[PDB]
Amino acid sequence: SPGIWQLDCTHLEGKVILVAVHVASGYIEAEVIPAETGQETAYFLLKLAGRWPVKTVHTDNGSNFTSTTVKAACWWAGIKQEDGIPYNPQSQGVIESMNKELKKIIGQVRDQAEHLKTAVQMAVFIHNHKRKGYSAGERIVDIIATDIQT
Amino acid sequence: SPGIWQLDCTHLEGKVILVAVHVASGYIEAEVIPAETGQETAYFLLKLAGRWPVKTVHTDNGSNFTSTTVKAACWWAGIKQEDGIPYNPQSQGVIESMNKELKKIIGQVRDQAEHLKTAVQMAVFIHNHKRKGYSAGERIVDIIATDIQT
Numbered sequence A, B: 001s002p003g004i005w006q007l008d009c010t011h012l013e014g015k016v017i018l019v020a021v022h023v024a025s026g027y028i029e030a031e032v033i034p035a036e037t038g039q040e041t042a043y044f045l046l047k048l049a050g051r052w053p054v055k056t057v058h059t060d061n062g063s064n065f066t067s068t069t070v071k072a073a074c075w076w077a078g079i080k081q082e083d084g085i086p087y088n089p090q091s092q093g094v095i096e097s098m099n100k101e102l103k104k105i106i107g108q109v110r111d112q113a114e115h116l117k118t119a120v121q122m123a124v125f126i127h128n129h130k131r132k133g134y135s136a137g138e139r140i141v142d143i144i145a146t147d148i149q150t
């Protein structure tokens, strides 16, 4: 559980926002990319795994699951690449609501930056710091610290 | 000191590697940029502060300290922007040693990627995961979790 992440790809302004969600905490990292490719996804996961102890990634679609570029990055970073089939039907709902929230926040900050990438990073910040009480940033650190003491 | 970070700029292959070091743990995040500008630095700090609870940044030089772009990002993200004067002379030595280590790791992986940015992310991964025994990635989580319980 401490090491499980889910990939999520959403669209805004003709661009693609790639999101990784730490499933247990709801903490996120995100980036804006021109299009989802294997190379973009592979690079994103490499960054993520250097920053948090990523054990398992539930990939966002079959193309990223298949991609030998993505598989090579997961091999390098010691990540178990898994499908993202929503065996628990609540998964679809949670991701959809997260995408909606993120787009809402992006609109609220959209005027405080020229470029979408900036607005997306502002949205990451607001999402991770929002107390709902603890924040997602607090939950992820608490979860992993609890794990390290095991 | 759970919230204290230090900026560090180093050069390789005609490009600039911007590094943020979590002082208490030695955990790092890094990116390759064409040149250090206020905009590049501001965006880097915005990303960092959305991902970790960044209270204070010791800036790497007077230009970034002065930059109104950098000050605006620090204001946005709730970061106290401070100078990076090495009042403790050991800090110069520590940063220089980190730069040398990072460049060594980049050399060791340089063949496993076409692009320097990839190699730098691999270096971040190796640095953060290396047990010295705990890793820097373990130390930062433990430090912050301890703080949250305060």
Ligand SMILES: C=CC[N@H+](Cc1ccccc1C(=O)N[C@H](C)CC)Cc1ccc2c(c1C(=O)O)OC[C@H](CCC(=O)O)O2
Residues within 6 Å of the ligand: A037, A039, A040, A041, A042, A043, A069, A072, A073, A076, B111, B112, B113, B114, B115, B116, B117, B118, B119
């Ligand atoms: C066709 C894939 C390209 N590479 C193949 C490669 C080339 C040479 C040696 C090893 C490997 C190799 O498979 N390496 C190991 C096993 C896995 C990391 C790896 C790679 C992936 C994503 C990137 C990269 C790079 C790069 O080669 O540096 O460069 C930046 C780019 C930025 C995002 C974007 O622009 O899409 O993301």
Ligand SMILES: C=CC[N@H+](Cc1ccccc1C(=O)N[C@H](C)CC)Cc1ccc2c(c1C(=O)O)OC[C@H](CCC(=O)O)O2
Residues within 6 Å of the ligand: A111, A112, A113, A114, A115, A116, A117, A118, A119, B037, B039, B040, B041, B042, B043, B069, B072, B073, B076
């Ligand atoms: C001259 C600065 C430009 N901006 C001024 C600005 C313009 C319009 C509205 C508000 C603000 C403003 O001051 N905003 C708040 C108060 C602080 C975020 C902010 C900004 C900084 C770094 C970036 C940006 C952007 C951007 O405008 O989106 O875009 C991506 C770029 C990528 C790194 C690179 O390419 O150097 O880093």
Ligand SMILES: [Cl-]
Residues within 6 Å of the ligand: A128, A129, A137, A138, B049, B050, B051, B052, B053
């Ligand atoms: Cl946070």
Ligand SMILES: [Cl-]
Residues within 6 Å of the ligand: A049, A050, A051, A052, A053, B128, B129, B137, B138
């Ligand atoms: Cl780690």
